[PDB]
Design an enzyme around this catalytic site. Structure first.
Site, PDB file in Angstrom:
ATOM      1  N   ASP A 118       0.956  -1.095   0.000  1.00 15.21           N
ATOM      2  CA  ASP A 118       0.000   0.000   0.000  1.00 15.21           C
ATOM      3  C   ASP A 118       1.010   1.156   0.000  1.00 15.21           C
ATOM      4  OD1 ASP A 118      -2.249   1.754   0.526  1.00 15.21           O
ATOM      5  OD2 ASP A 118      -1.495   1.900   2.600  1.00 15.21           O
ATOM      6  N   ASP A 150       0.222   5.069   0.838  1.00 13.71           N
ATOM      7  CA  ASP A 150      -0.065   6.016   1.899  1.00 13.71           C
ATOM      8  C   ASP A 150      -0.177   5.385   3.281  1.00 13.71           C
ATOM      9  OD1 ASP A 150      -0.895   8.499  -0.104  1.00 13.71           O
ATOM     10  OD2 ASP A 150      -0.901   9.159   2.016  1.00 13.71           O
TER      11      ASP A 150
HETATM   12 MG   LIG Z   1      -3.244   3.570   3.645  1.00 11.59          MG
END
Ligand SMILES: [Mg+2]
Length: 258
Positions: free
Chosen positions: A10, A12
């Site tokens: 992932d 962020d």
């Molecule tokens: Mg995230």
């Protein structure tokens, strides 16, 4: 005969701290100034989109939720785009398709030629305000990116391990972001997937189709979307919620030889 792992990350709040700079959760969780957190968050934001509009045809591409960078490579004649003029050329759906592909392949070229020289893409004085920003950001995040990079580069240097990126952010903005955070060199561009449209699990399955059933997939992330999609496809999930989780992952990365 070698076992092989694909690490599906992932972006962020996993590899980078960005959104949580704007909401004040990172500053709050780690005792940082919230005013400074937001100032930095917004400055990065402006840099990400400025780079995206200025060099990645975002004003053009925005309204096109393409998952992968090479999804419209069908309509690409492979000609040279060095002297090609995108401004005046049209901006339909067949000969128009060829102009799309031209822009995405051109994005790919920018990425590869500048993933290690992002200051040359951005120029001066942008390059200088950028290096200063990354400096305040690293200080505020207590070197979060330094920690994620140690795992990313270990997966990179390792022969039977691969780095893949699935992000809910759109493709163009996601690449400007990856470049501005210095991840361009750790992530091959063909390995980035924008789950903006189809969703995380759709991208997750598409990635398994690409790498095969004989590979061991590891979903790394901080959110529910990746964790849930990891479960439905029965793939081990490694949650990240602090610097310590990154340290643990890096440690596992160094004990194994495939
Ligand atoms: Mg995230």
């Amino acid at each position: 005969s070698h076992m092989e792992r694909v690490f599906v990350w992932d972006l962020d709040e996993t590899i980078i701290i960005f959104h949580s700079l704007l909401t004040g959760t990172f500053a709050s969780r780690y005792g940082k100034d919230t005013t400074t957190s937001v100032r930095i968050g917004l400055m990065m934001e402006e840099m990400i989109f400025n780079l995206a509009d200025t060099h990645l045809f975002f004003n053009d591409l925005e309204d096109c939720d393409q998952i992968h960078v090479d999804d419209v490579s069908s309509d690409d004649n492979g000609q040279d785009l060095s002297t090609y003029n995108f401004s005046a050329d049209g901006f339909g759906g067949v000969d128009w398709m060829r102009k799309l592909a031209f822009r995405y392949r051109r994005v790919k070229e920018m990425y590869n030629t500048y993933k290690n020289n992002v200051g040359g893409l951005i120029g001066t004085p942008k390059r200088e305000t950028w290096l200063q920003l990354r400096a305040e950001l690293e200080a505020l995040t207590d070197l979060w990116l330094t920690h994620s990079l140690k795992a990313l580069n270990l997966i990179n240097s390792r022969p039977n391990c691969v780095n893949v990126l699935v992000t809910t952010t759109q493709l163009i903005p996601a690449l400007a972001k990856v470049l501005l955070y210095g991840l361009g060199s750790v992530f091959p561009i063909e390995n980035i997937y924008s789950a903006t449209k189809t969703g995380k699990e759709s991208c997750f399955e598409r990635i398994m189709q690409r790498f095969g059933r004989k590979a061991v997939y590891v979903v790394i992330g901080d959110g529910v979307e990746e964790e849930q999609g990891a479960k439905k496809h029965n793939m081990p999930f490694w949650r990240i919620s602090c610097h310590a989780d990154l340290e643990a992952l890096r440690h596992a990365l160094e004990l194994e030889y495939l």
